[PDB]
Amino acid sequence: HHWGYGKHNGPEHWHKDFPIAKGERQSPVDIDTHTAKYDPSLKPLSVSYDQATSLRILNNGHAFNVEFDDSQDKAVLKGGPLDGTYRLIQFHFHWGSLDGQGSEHTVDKKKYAAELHLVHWNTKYGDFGKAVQQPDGLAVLGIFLKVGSAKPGLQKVVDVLDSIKTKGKSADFTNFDPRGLLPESLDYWTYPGSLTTPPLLECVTWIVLKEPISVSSEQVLKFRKLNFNGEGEPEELMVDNWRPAQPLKNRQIKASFK
Ligand SMILES: COc1ccc(CCNC(=O)c2ccc(S(N)(=O)=O)cc2)cc1OC
Ligand SMILES: [Zn+2]
């Protein structure tokens, strides 16, 4: 009886094995754009992905991860709310069964079709495993997806998904450039939060871009053909792999833009 997104194992059940699910800085949250405040203390955000080295794509039974070589400083996030350097380790998405849902964060209660998470760890802690024992261990750059025009830079991901249909399947995935998944603007909201999947660890500085990227209907339809189950198990489409918004509690969401 593993955690998942179903009626008997989904987000309303996670707190039994992971009591931090009801903690003080859980993610995602609704971003009330009317209560978020511009923060002039925020430094310019620097997304430096030109030397990224992707390695592999993996269906882990809850999403698919594009993994990077993080053995050296190569693809890093710094600036904004962050102190020091955060190295990219993987990206993944959350998405819906229908175009009107799928994102984890919401913007004035609006759900997007999907949400991209670029996951980074603070190099002052040496390894990802040590980083997830720290309140400032991780930084996740979140990008909303809406359905409209295709995102050309996403197609190479779309086209490998047939090789990782089921849980535990991986494939080589070298030379993928995550710069092709960014929007034009780096305007963002930031707040302190958590992983949005078990173990729900409260280690994350969230940086959520305001401008969504557009993907085509056909691209997100291919996401929805993935499976949560393993090969030769009953087929459960990998859809609606999002956690709903959690209580903001004693947090303030800051805006990078006036
Ligand atoms: C060996 O030590 C660990 C290794 C990994 C983890 C956490 C695994 N989960 C994630 O890395 C992760 C989960 C959700 C996100 S999200 N959806 O918030 O971007 C990002 C990363 C926890 C660990 O320590 C228990
Ligand atoms: Zn995620």
Side-chain angles (χ1 to χ4, degrees):
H1 195 81
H2 191 270
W3 69 268
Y5 294 97
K7 183 193 171 153
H8 300 275
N9 66 357
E12 301 324 305
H13 289 272
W14 294 352
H15 74 99
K16 289 172 274 169
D17 282 328
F18 306 96
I20 204 171
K22 295 178 176 289
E24 301 304 315
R25 56 164 290 181
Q26 290 289 292
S27 293
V29 300
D30 180 59
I31 301 167
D32 178 338
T33 66
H34 294 106
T35 295
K37 193 183 184 186
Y38 173 62
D39 187 350
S41 72
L42 290 166
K43 300 303 175 165
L45 191 65
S46 171
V47 185
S48 309
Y49 287 170
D50 65 315
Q51 289 277 333
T53 303
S54 69
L55 288 172
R56 193 172 77 132
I57 191 172
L58 173 66
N59 177 337
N60 61 24
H62 45 276
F64 62 85
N65 288 357
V66 171
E67 299 165 352
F68 292 77
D69 176 1
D70 60 348
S71 65
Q72 264 184 118
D73 254 357
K74 286 215 212 204
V76 308
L77 186 68
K78 67 175 49 159
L82 302 175
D83 311 310
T85 297
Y86 287 69
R87 194 179 293 181
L88 179 66
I89 182 167
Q90 55 107 328
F91 70 77
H92 62 273
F93 306 79
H94 307 260
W95 61 91
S97 55
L98 308 159
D99 296 349
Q101 63 200 56
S103 64
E104 297 210 300
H105 295 89
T106 54
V107 179
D108 297 330
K109 297 297 179 79
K110 175 189 174 76
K111 295 174 166 144
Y112 288 86
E115 188 174 329
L116 166 60
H117 290 163
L118 296 130
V119 182
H120 313 73
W121 56 274
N122 189 333
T123 61
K124 74 178 167 199
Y125 301 124
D127 70 68
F128 179 91
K130 179 70 56 56
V132 301
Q133 300 173 46
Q134 319 301 329
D136 60 350
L138 297 180
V140 184
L141 180 59
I143 306 178
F144 295 119
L145 281 61
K146 63 179 289 256
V147 171
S149 70
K151 191 71 167 173
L154 183 60
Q155 194 61 34
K156 282 166 179 209
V157 173
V158 166
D159 278 340
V160 78
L161 294 185
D162 287 329
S163 75
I164 59 152
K165 184 184 183 184
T166 54
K167 180 176 66 81
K169 292 202 172 270
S170 76
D172 305 311
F173 200 67
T174 55
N175 305 102
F176 180 81
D177 188 343
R179 296 180 290 181
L181 299 176
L182 308 176
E184 285 180 6
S185 182
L186 294 176
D187 288 348
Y188 65 85
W189 300 282
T190 185
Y191 76 96
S194 75
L195 305 180
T196 69
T197 58
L200 302 170
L201 297 168
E202 293 183 335
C203 307
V204 183
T205 302
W206 278 96
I207 300 169
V208 177
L209 300 190
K210 175 166 167 191
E211 178 175 13
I213 61 165
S214 297
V215 304
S216 64
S217 188
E218 301 75 1
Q219 290 176 319
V220 68
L221 282 162
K222 291 196 179 183
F223 287 18
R224 301 181 185 134
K225 292 193 216 175
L226 287 164
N227 289 181
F228 285 123
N229 56 276
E231 183 180 6
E233 291 178 5
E235 182 174 46
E236 287 177 336
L237 293 181
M238 184 178 282
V239 296
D240 294 317
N241 61 345
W242 53 277
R243 190 191 196 191
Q246 300 301 306
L248 190 61
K249 305 206 158 156
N250 178 42
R251 295 179 288 178
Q252 286 181 328
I253 302 181
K254 294 302 191 183
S256 75
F257 62 93
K258 287 168 176 166

